[PDB]
Design a protein that fits this description.
part of a larger assembly; 4 chains; A: mainly alpha; rod-shaped; B: alpha+beta; 9 strands; Tuberin (chain B); Hamartin (chains A, D); gene regulation; TSC complex
Chain lengths: 48, 324, 208, 48
């Protein structure tokens, strides 16, 4: 069981740290999109 | 001025503002005055105004955002129909809501056994003070009672985001307000009856009224011989070139359609440019121009009108039949 | 027992309980022995402390149960690590507010054209933790009212290069933030505070 | 006991991989909505 567990757990820890950094950046990408939306309205505020 | 001033040294103003305020009042008083608390950080109308001034100072010192909220779409989906309550406390109006349990990922599709526990964490708090309303999406971290009542920790709090893609709501309220040994009626939290549709209706009507100031102004273009016409005035179209120019640079406009919500004044959704000045404290719409064509009443009801002369001694107030 | 007591029909005894409590303080002293049961809103000094602790525990465990230990998810730490903080004592409760300055983001980047207003991006997140006798519990928060579209300089917030920086971060695999004082002021500013004891107190952050 | 802990975290880790994978998708949809908003900003902001 120990052999199986370490052979799985190395990749476990690595991909989990990945999983972590990926989700944090995804959460950050939301602030950008929100600012985009607000600036879109600001611009879109004026009529063509 | 307290709005547009630069962020630093905004606070220290509040001392002097409050000083002038409260020294101004009490020249004819019945009530012992109440100061601020930023040392840690008919006269009825007078008190109303002073309260409003303090409210604005508070809600606007130390930072400045939109005066209204707008919850994220996935947010709204999450607490959709969650169990909610509301408590008047002082002059504020606190309100909270709590999720129901349904999982976004549960719909998205092991760990599906505790998705009610995952979901049930997040709630929402919302305060409606005189100077506008703000809110927050609350997220719990203190887990359940394991002994009495291997779980995805990060991805749990993940799904609470901005625009990506039941627990008794009284809980958090009594959390943030439970100094027990006082608050008899001076600062007594007060629940309103969920049954009391009258009170709920009154709270709604309160939401229906805007937080910023209201102004609407009638802009007219008379001609040269159109003086004292009272129809060629209104029925006019395609005003002089200079009048049209001055009109272009008159703030900003928003076309009336699906794009523009009732957020700004939508008076007369029928037909176009209807230029509308706009900032945060006040908002002035120019409800009618020559370009606009109840309508006759629409422009006969605007309390004040700017009018483009374009004649020689065109106008006297007696000319216009606009009573308002 | 009140813990082992069912979550439903838990509030029921609460007044009776404090009644049973106030009826044990009948004649020991009656300075402020008032009911104060939250059914409305929903030496003998040792006896006062007793009543305090018991009703506080009830309030903590009425309407649900929850362990008295908070442990923030990694996301919270990443967001508000080293954040600007402030703690007050509204009454016997200890309230603490913390505010993020986007430390981990600027870490993601490791340029004033970006780093100058990088914290401005995530300047919304915050965290409020309250420690009562019954333990401490907290919540992470995200204000959801955008900046003043014109009076709070949100237009001059270049973001295309920020998106480019975000892509770069993905490849990697005066005051710099808002003042947490704001949130607290918001959540308690009944301007005519009608109970002097309830007047919140800011402990001086610097004198340790 | 230690190995039980390790294997349990392994099962939790591998089981949460579908959840980790989900984040990937949302990344693409955020990217494309970012593009849409940026080009909306283009054709309504970069005007004459």
């Amino acid at each position: 069981l120990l052999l199986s567990q370490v052979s799985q757990k190395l990749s476990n820890s690595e991909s989990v740290q990945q999983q972590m950094e990926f989700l944090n950046r995804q959460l950050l990408v939301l602030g950008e999109v929100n600012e985009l939306y607000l600036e879109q309205l600001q611009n879109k505020h004026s009529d063509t | 001025w307290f709005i547009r001033c630069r962020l630093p040294f905004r606070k220290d103003f509040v001392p002097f503002i409050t000083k002038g305020l409260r020294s101004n009042v009490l020249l004819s008083f019945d009530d012992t005055p109440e100061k601020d608390s930023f040392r840690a950080r008919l006269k009825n109308l007078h008190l109303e105004l002073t309260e409003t001034c303090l409210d604005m100072m508070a809600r606007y010192v130390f930072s400045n955002f939109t005066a209204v909220p707008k919850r994220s779409p996935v947010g709204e989906f999450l607490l959709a129909g969650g169990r909610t309550k509301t408590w008047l406390v002082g002059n504020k109006l606190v309100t909270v809501t709590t999720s129901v349990g349904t999982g976004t990922r549960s719909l998205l599709g092991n760990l599906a056994a505790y998705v009610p526990l995952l979901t049930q964490g997040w709630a929402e708090i919302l305060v409606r003070r005189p100077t506008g309303n703000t809110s927050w999406l609350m997220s719990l971290e203190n887990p359940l009672s394991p002994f009495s009542s291997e779980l995805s920790n990060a991805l749990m709090a993940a799904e609470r985001f901005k625009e990506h893609r039941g627990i008794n709501p009284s809980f958090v309220f009594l959390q943030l307000y439970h100094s027990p040994f006082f608050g008899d009626e001076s600062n007594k939290p007060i629940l309103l009856p969920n049954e009391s549709q009258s009170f709920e209706r009154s709270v709604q009507l309160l939401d229906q009224i805007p937080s910023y100031d209201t102004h609407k102004i009638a802009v007219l273009y008379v001609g040269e011989g159109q003086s004292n016409s009272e129809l060629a005035i209104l029925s006019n179209e395609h005003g002089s070139y200079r009048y049209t120019e001055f009109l272009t640079g008159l703030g900003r406009l928003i076309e009336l359609k699906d794009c523009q919500p009732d957020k700004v004044y939508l008076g007369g959704l029928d037909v176009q440019f209807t230029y509308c000045w706009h900032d945060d404290i006040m908002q002035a719409v120019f409800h009618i121009a020559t370009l606009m064509p109840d309508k006759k009443r629409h422009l006969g009801n605007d309390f004040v009108s700017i009018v483009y002369n374009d004649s020689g001694e065109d106008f006297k107030l007696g000319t216009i039949k606009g009573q308002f | 027992w009140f813990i082992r007591c069912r979550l439903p029909f838990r509030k029921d005894f609460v007044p009776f309980i404090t009644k049973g409590l106030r009826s044990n303080v009948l004649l020991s002293f009656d300075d402020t022995p008032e009911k104060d049961s939250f059914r409305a809103r929903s030496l003998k000094n040792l006896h006062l402390e007793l009543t305090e602790t018991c009703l506080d525990m009830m309030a903590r465990y009425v309407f649900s149960n929850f362990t008295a230990v908070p442990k923030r998810s990694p996301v919270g730490e990443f967001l508000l690590a080293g954040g600007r903080t402030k703690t007050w004592l509204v009454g016997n409760k200890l309230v603490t507010v913390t505010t993020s300055v986007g430390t981990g983001t600027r870490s993601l980047l490791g340029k004033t054209n970006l780093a100058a207003y990088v914290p401005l991006l995530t300047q919304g997140w915050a965290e409020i933790l309250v420690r009562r006798p019954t333990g401490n519990t907290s919540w992470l928060m995200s204000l959801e009212n955008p900046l003043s579209p014109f009076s709070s300089d949100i237009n001059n917030m270049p973001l295309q290069e920020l998106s480019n920086a975000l892509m770069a971060a993905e490849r990697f695999k005066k005051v710099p933030g808002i003042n947490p004082s704001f949130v607290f002021l918001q959540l308690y500013h009944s301007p005519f505070f009608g109970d002097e004891s309830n007047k919140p107190i800011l402990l001086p952050n610097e004198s340790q």
